[model samples]
Target: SRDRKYLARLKLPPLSKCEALRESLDLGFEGMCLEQPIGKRLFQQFLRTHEQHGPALQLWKDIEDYDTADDALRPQKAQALRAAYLEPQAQLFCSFLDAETVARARAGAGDGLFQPLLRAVLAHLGQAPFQEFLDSLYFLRFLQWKWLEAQPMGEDWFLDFRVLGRGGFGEVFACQMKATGKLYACKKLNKKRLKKRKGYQGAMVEKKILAKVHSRFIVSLAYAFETKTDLCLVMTIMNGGDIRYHIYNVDEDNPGFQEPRAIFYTAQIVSGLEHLHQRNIIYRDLKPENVLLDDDGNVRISDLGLAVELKAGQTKTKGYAGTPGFMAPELLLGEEYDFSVDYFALGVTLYEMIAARGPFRARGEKVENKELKQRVLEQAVTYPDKFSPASKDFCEALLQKDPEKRLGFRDGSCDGLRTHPLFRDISWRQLEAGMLTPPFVPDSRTVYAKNIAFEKADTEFFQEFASGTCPIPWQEEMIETGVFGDLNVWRP
Candidate 1:
């Protein structure tokens, strides 16, 4: 229905300057009104009004190359127009824009394709608000292109490789950048894949979830965009890599971490989990894969992509989500579980980090299904005598089979298990202040684990840290090194 208005605008007049075209862009309601399947004359009038105020309108009765079974595919034809007509002007207007006022624009709209904050901001700025008005000018430019259609602008820059690794998620590629590189991950989620799904609604959910969260341990999002052929989510990347790989490499030969390194990582993980609970974000997927190491070897909790924000009065999460092995007993019971379930996973992760094993296993231990669930509900599985008493005690408290007895002391005070005897001699404050030195100092001679024989320990690697594979843009040190074994070596 709206297609006619676009056609009609052409007959009215050609705009003398870019400024008028900008203002006319904001009149979405008018465009919507003109879209009605009216006769050519009235449509022409609408077109005239639009063109009279903006740039020249060119009508195409048959956009042959633009035709596709999917509406998303149609936009690629307009890419040139987008870059030419919209991107620059949008940047100009957002230079001085106020987010608060922008938010108020759609402050009252119903929930739908766009986020409330997004709608409000766009509504506040006439469709073509100045690019110079935005708090962050680049964000303004992104918004402008987004309004036109969520395409990203700007040329790709060469990235720092010292801190990132590349990994794959299905066909999508995540180029993991170092924390110091910036607070962003450049993922290439192909648009074709997105359109083939039931509906591409994940974008809206992600924006809403990321908008409200602010934390040190949490990998916060900065912005997201969808284009004709791809979707890009600009987010923080963990530099140190995933903790799972760390566990996968643990062995008895090494002296094990003296108090310094173990406590450093434990406190970091605890703090991140604490922040997530406070925000009502249930991190269903908690494992070494999601816990990342920052540049300084501090733990940075990541991968909230599947993380759900529990509504008020919510009990258990509504559906089955999370890695198979790391799931909590309540989650395995097919019952709704709350934030406490995350702590259970944390306990499991901790045990694996130090002892290289969890209480239950798919192969070694017999899982009685319902009986196992009941037992875990009663009290978490006990650690073996091979583990130190202190570490075992801490695990028992954290993985308490009963939710009530669990060590969910996830307050911001770092009171819970951050300073437990298990973590004794660990200076939580010094790490946060960047005063404490990382115990796993990296260098050519320094092994990731004693006798492990690999590249410099400081060399970065990307695993399932956060969501999936992260790669340093193009670091030869990591890419060319023999440290990372071929993932598919056993596949064939």
Candidate 2:
């Protein structure tokens, strides 16, 4: 029967885990103050403890929601909130408000309905009750547990582990480099597959983008080799599947991530996105499907098929490209957009990853026409009250419909978003230093990819180009003349 109350009350997490969470008690007040630490014994204690305070917590949350209400609808929202709490004959009389404030509130108080009340109730909770919660046995019981997480390889002929996804050219296999024995996905493209169509440009574009960008957060291009029938990229392997898989299919009860996990992902992705932007590239098609995770549960942005690089001096790129439900409003409106579009998509991803559903649509819902487009242009995303105010504020900034108003890089510097309060728990220095604890470490023995049928070998260039390095003569000539060819430009 999936009874949450019964389930939560009886299902005790191991004492070791609880103790590890306790190591983070120093963060407990910050958690409550920041409105995060969304899932834990501490939050649960506050929830259960506040239940006896006559819906005060819920009333405060509803008041916050009312404040977020759009200007045109404030009247209805104000009346609904007052009748639900402030009135004597209401659902539950909140005796905290003075009778005069209550009288004015009942007299159809408009926009300023809760100025004094919001302050009093908000000030009331964090002052005395929070102190009480600390000494409560529940808080004492919560005193508990606390808390590479990159690369490339050579050798064109890899030890093909298995297939990963069905994509642009040929088989994408979990292949290990012959030299380092490090795992990577070999996205080998058949020359014949691109010889007849426009696919060659896309493959080349993908190659150049990966080649130019070298980042820990981004999947790096280790080596490239060409055969009689195929051209291949030997690069990083992300075995933990895409973020979408975790969001929708991880389990029945656990669909979305907790606050900490979501925060972890957001930081890494912003790091990756900043890397792309500095190279004057716009990652126009960011979505959960394009973001893949490694065995350590760390993520890498994959699928450069739609990535577009701006001309050397340019600041903007134009095109109608992006996944539906995640596309920026300007793209649909045919307005010129820049890297800020990626932030909008990241905001969408953040919402979906935290809520396990799109900000605009529920999971599995489909639309094919101009309707979703309309919503993208005019809609506002709402959050569950459980979401922290700081996080909600960050999401709102990124999802702003106007590109000029969007939260984005400040003159190619990431300090703008890196400084946002949503990341107060994050140390950007440590994130790049590669020392964050893994939110999830997928099984080492497991192959976290979809099944695919094996095929006979059509590869004939494995041995010839396996080394994938420049010949001695070619290197000598290029060094002598200061020029080179083959596999495009060689400039770093």
Candidate 3:
């Protein structure tokens, strides 16, 4: 009841900040930070944050408008352009344009008059304002994320590199988008395996669901295209490795995470879970392995393979999904369930992150299906002696044996779980907007995988995706460029 408002807020149409996260590989780092629509709005935002910047940016855009304006409007536009940035003592009087060249361009014809002036405008932009924008962390972060969302993508657009991890259904590789030079993790579901094809259905289901979602805490599907033998799902590349790696493998001396680190990750997972459930998708699978860390050390949920989508007007489903040691009691007992199962899994994940072990299991212990199910049903959740009071209370609420009494609502709202004292210090707004800095940063340059294989010829399947843009033009670009004579132009 207390947190339903929070859940209601989550269910609202996603934040635009989160939606645009699928921005292209164009960091704007490589080129002149010209005022393209991609960065211009956010750049304007950045400029506002500074409280002020010279009107050179506006002036540059002014010349562009003057250049592209209807030829009839150029004479008056030039007059204002002069007063705005050209005339001495003008509000935006820019020093880069020599009065001599200005006079010559003024005498020139049409929009061509501004070519020399246009070059001068950009010349000023490059030297000062652009460099200042680059120096700020805010602009640098914003500039990297840019792109028009959704078109068609192909394997040829990417240069495949190391296999990040291999799965039974597909292999994920770190690949760079050739067009923008941005890196992505491409999940190539092998058609050879699926074409035979029971799970091929699952592949497509996952594809449809992946495409439906775009969230900061959840992995984003930026592009998807296929080869005859494979369907490539390219997404945001998480180079920080999975949560399991950080918990069990990173440090021998400090097993698991400290309280703050554990809380941050748990908060991230909550954000991700809310986003998933809000979309009417149930992430039946949630665990340390399924949760990955990005370069900034923030958590991201990946591998929606086991997830199930609820039909319109439907809230409950029956199925066995998810890894052991994490599945909820209701799911394990073969009862009808909904999103509550995922919160139970979040509790298990939170426990593992903090204690370095599941609440009811030992480190490195493998619990079998029936046994794990029995433990989940009958066993009490036990915690480490070192757990703080709030941590214990948080896990205890989520791990309730009865779904009715659990932290998540049957209605699929994770109402007040994050409001628990353990997370009292968190600013939910900053966390959702990605303004909060994570406690850790992953070193993407270092080798994290101990036995990460050399995926040389493994890319043979992706190479078969040879199509890029249709250069010859189909109908518009089709030979409609010139109508053929006689029956050559016959319609189907």
Best candidate, TM-score-wise? 3
**C-alpha lDDT score of every prediction, in listed order:** 0.48, 0.68, 0.68
lDDT of 3 by residue, 1-492 (tens): 112222222121223553454354344432425423334544555555563455656666777666555445768888887777766667776666677866775566642667777777666656655677767754544423221122244665677867777768578888765534466777877765754555645766787777677677888776667775677877777888788988887797778898888899888888888988888898988898888887777889988999899998998999988888888888888899988899888888888888888877788788777777788889998877879999999899889978889887435456577657998877665677676777777666326433333133434433433232221111111122221111122256
Model 1: per-residue Cα lDDT over 1-492, one tens digit each: 112322222121222333443555443433322222111122333334453312222211112222211344434434533333234453212222245533342133321212333334334333432222222332232223223221222113213223233343312223323311233454545545444552245544554566566555766554444444455555565554576655554434542344346556777777777776777777777887788766656667776666788778665566777765566766776776788778888887777676565556522466655555565555437565557778778888877666777777544344666657877765554444445567774222111212102233211211111122111211111223321122102245
> How many steric overlaps does candidate 3 have?
5
Clash totals, every prediction: 44, 11, 5
Per-residue lDDT tens digits for candidate 2, residues 296-411, read: 76888988879999997888878888888889999989989899899999999998888888888877788765878888988888999757887799899999999899999878
Ranking by TM-score: 3, 2, 1
Q: Pairing residues by index, what is the TM-score of model 1? A: 0.51
Candidate 2's C-alpha lDDT? 0.68
* Order of the predicted models by lDDT, top scorer first: 2, 3, 1
Alpha carbon RMSD to native, model 3: 18.4
Q: How does each model score on TM-score?
A: 0.51, 0.60, 0.63
Candidate 3 — which pairs collide? 3-415, 24-146, 473-477, 473-478, 474-478
